Design an enzyme around this catalytic site. Structure first.
Site, PDB file in Angstrom:
ATOM      1  N   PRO C   1      36.836  43.137  44.482  1.00 61.84           N
ATOM      2  CA  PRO C   1      35.531  42.533  44.802  1.00 61.84           C
ATOM      3  C   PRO C   1      34.995  41.734  43.632  1.00 61.84           C
ATOM      4  O   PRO C   1      35.421  41.954  42.498  1.00 61.84           O
ATOM      5  CB  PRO C   1      34.631  43.743  45.071  1.00 61.84           C
ATOM      6  CG  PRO C   1      35.266  44.848  44.254  1.00 61.84           C
ATOM      7  CD  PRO C   1      36.745  44.608  44.386  1.00 61.84           C
ATOM      8  N   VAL C   2      34.068  40.819  43.899  1.00 66.71           N
ATOM      9  CA  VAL C   2      33.400  40.057  42.850  1.00 66.71           C
ATOM     10  C   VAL C   2      31.958  40.534  42.783  1.00 66.71           C
ATOM     11  O   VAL C   2      31.274  40.590  43.812  1.00 66.71           O
ATOM     12  CB  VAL C   2      33.472  38.544  43.122  1.00 66.71           C
ATOM     13  CG1 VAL C   2      32.744  37.760  42.011  1.00 66.71           C
ATOM     14  CG2 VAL C   2      34.925  38.098  43.228  1.00 66.71           C
TER      15      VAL C   2
END
Lengths: 64, 64, 64, 64, 64, 64
Positions: C1-2
């Site tokens: 994820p970012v």
């Protein structure tokens, strides 16, 4: 400029377009960006995906 | 909602605050987001970091 | 994820690294994202670029 | 501050809320941002929309 | 489309323009977005603001 | 680096993967970022959520 709008789901197409046009005018008028440079991007999410000060936001319905 | 504004550097503090206030009003009035829920975030970049349709945007100076 | 973190300027290198590590652990532990998949990105802005509910946020100084 | 979390779809509502609360605490504790200033935004996408080092990420199921 | 590029500081103006042009061509050729619709935005940060899998990225210098 | 791609819905999985691979190569080749550091994130929206110079963008179909 790029204006990203992460809003809660549940608005009509007309409300979202009114928002994008009002933001475009607001940006043009306040900082002098030419309209041709302005790119508004709208993303919708559920209220539960907006957690402000640790609290989820309610779903938008427009009921009042 | 979150409104991210990636704009070119060179505006005054007064112009950027005017933009943030006008966007806050625009979002409140068009989609019914309570003002308390609105978060406007401004980021400045050089004009060269905005490449639209393959072309770099010029620097903003306030002059023309 | 970012995980993108738009924070106000003025924190030390140690505070920002502590934040990135704590977010990495929090994301790993709560949603099961492998640490290898996690990318935390920090951007600093002046307090004046954070306009919440129509009001500018103050500068962060570490003092109070 | 604004914390944007682009995560893969497939977590429960409880996992996502646990993530948002843990991130809120982590940010508050490490950089001293008041909880009232913290806005966490969650966006879900398929694993195929996360391309890290040229490779797509698998779908999340929590199976292990 | 909007293509946001959060990269580490230290590249030349020529490298960043080359990147923006190459991304514009890549997006146009792979998904059929007209060049007129493409907006590439570049933001630079210190390497320490990129924390991937719990580890800070090094500064970019152009040397190795 | 993080490369966020907000594109209009309607492309095939293969088109989106081709885009992500071409962007990964383009970034690696132009600014010297190692492939291992590159994270491409794709988000799809309707054309009506892209408002450029005050005008909504059409839906993508690939028909031509």
């Amino acid at each position: 400029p790029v204006i990203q709008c992460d809003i809660r789901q549940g608005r009509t197409a007309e409300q979202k377009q009114a928002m994008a046009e009002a933001i475009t005018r607001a940006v043009h008028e306040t900082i002098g960006a030419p309209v041709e440079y302005i790119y508004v991007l709208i993303r919708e999410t559920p209220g539960a995906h907006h957690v402000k000060a640790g609290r989820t936001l309610p779903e938008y319905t427009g009921d009042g």
